[PDB]
Amino acid sequence: SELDRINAQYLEVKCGAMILKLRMEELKILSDTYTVEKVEVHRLIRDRLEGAIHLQEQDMENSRQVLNSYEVLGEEFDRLVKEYTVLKQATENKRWALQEFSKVYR
């Protein structure tokens, strides 16, 4: 019983040693990964990404607000949107053919 007790106490003492060695390797790799310059550079990356993305969802929010303001008018204006989209698609189809024929003639 004393033999097994000393065996298990040795295992309990030894397991923490390699656990803390694992902790040392993780902490030392984390320390060597980011130096003094790299921490401030990554903070500037956080600032730059925030400054860009605060413009980005602002642009998408403005676009969605414009779409909602068009949707306020009603389904008749939605039919007008579809009709003018079809008319402008046909219009650009004729315009591109005219431009291509003008380029061919030159």
């Binding site: 694992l22 790799i29 984390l30 060597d32 990964t33 790299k38 990554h42 990356i45 730059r48 990404l49």
Partner: protein
């Protein structure tokens, strides 16, 4: 495996894969690295 990933992160990707050409529009970091490789290869050829 988490420590293996942490080992990989420092070795090849220290914020390098977090950049594009739209952010910092002038020239992107892979283009700077390619220009550095070309210039340093020219310098190494001239030195040898």
């Amino acid at each position: 495996p988490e420590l293996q990933g942490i080992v990989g992160d420092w070795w090849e990707q220290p914020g390098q894969a977090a950049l594009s050409e739209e952010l910092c529009q002038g020239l992107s970091l892979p283009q700077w690295r390619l220009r550095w490789v070309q210039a340093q290869g020219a310098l190494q050829k001239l030195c040898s």
